[PDB]
């Protein structure tokens, strides 16, 4: 009745596939595995989808035993917060392009939420558009199917035969070789038996910004750099809201050169200094450079594909990186490497980082984080762990001399010392370093405070405060790092949009990042799912929408 049933047989197949020298040997072994599993007396039948769950990218609900007979089916147990699930989506996209509904394959996303916020249908509907998921989707918010199957990992794939008989499970990310081997040979087998039908299954506004991930402010000239993630472009905008430069879009890409030529792929982090913007070009797995004087884009880090390198050390364009989410200047570029749960550095000029030797110009490496997904604090940077670090902010002045890290999957904020690299707790989470489920919405001191998937931090040098974009609680919070006291600055915690209002009566919706102005009078917020930049006046305590024209 559970995925336990496949484990002795499928691991016996996987042991043979490692001694298999030819692609034909591997194909015949998988075919022999399916002869065995198909000819079992008692199928490991999938539970039916619970009735009255909400479905996306379909006309009506889908049921395994009325609508998916005669089909190979890939269930994707996933949640949109998890970077491991995000990394899998390109592999499912490539599978759907290879094998249509007509060819006998359907993929179903069984959205099984980690966080409370992701249970809300409209927040899944946004995520579907953000990540461009064009296959059927079910909001299994209580995670009934997950708990019945004893799924234990985000993501889990479960491949079904034509009568809902479970054939394979693939746990986690980057099993593209096996996903293709298993589904291709599953189709081949059941087509040779004449059990795969060729029937169809039914599947299904120009604003100026579209899901803006991040924003930053030039200290000298008070211009905004907005990552307009959904339009796959960067905007340079004056303080009054007039657009100076639009760079990229409307389509994805990796193209360098002039600004009509240039293209990005869901950019998040942006930083600026001396007319040079660095972009964390997240789904390209690249750092890009925009030169505003020369009016040219170039690539400074990443090879263009998802790294699994946890150590690094190569020069820029020969160093694989994994889903860079935020960037800030330090002379160095600090990088929140969400994909490998680490803080990285690109050395813009040749220099030396805390607890390492001199490194040459262009060297791209890990600074902090083991690479394990953990809420682990440590005096030694390598032995500490992060959990999808998505925000940075530099406080270089004394007595801080630290990098503030929004650590999203842990629901904490972290300091990393710029003297000795010590990664220390600030607010949120629990003491247990393997506990990634210590989330909530509580104002308090240290571990007593609770956050929910925070994506942005910005440091106020004037007031000695940190503003946290506490994204899934739909709230800007304020942390005093001396006392470690964390409290709500603005946001009711609902998502019903409001243009002009006070801080306590204003609203946000999954704010992806934020940044303070030079003067310390304005706090700009990338209010992602409202498709808007929110300007918070810290003097009048009024929120306004930045007009863009």
Numbering used by the authors: 9 to 212, 219 to 344, 354 to 572
What do the authors say?
NHLRC2 (NHL repeat containing protein 2) is an essential cytosolic protein of unknown function, mutation of which was recently identified in association with FINCA (fibrosis, neurodegeneration, cerebral angiomatosis) disease, a multi-organ condition which is fatal in early childhood. NHLRC2 contains three domains; an N-terminal thioredoxin-like (Trx-like) domain, followed by a six-bladed NHL repeat containing β-propeller domain and then a C-terminal β-stranded domain. The N-terminal Trx-like domain contains a CCINC motif at the position of the CXXC motif, which is characteristic of oxidoreductases and commonly involved in thiol-disulfide exchange.
Crystals of the longer NHLRC2 fragment (aa 1–572) diffracted to 2.7 Å and also belong to space group P21 but contain four protein molecules in the asymmetric unit. However, in each molecule the electron density for first 9 amino acid residues, the loop connecting the Trx-like domain and β-propeller domain (212–219) and the fragment between residues 345 and 354 were either missing or of insufficient quality to allow the chain tracing, suggesting flexibility of these regions. There are also two additional N-terminal α-helices which fold over the Trx-like domain of NHLRC2 in the crystal structure, forming an N-terminal protrusion. The CXXC motif or CCINC in NHLRC2 (residues 89–93) is located at the N-terminus of α1 of the thioredoxin-fold, with Cys-89 and Cys-90 protruding from the protein surface. All cysteines of the CCINC motif are found in the reduced state.
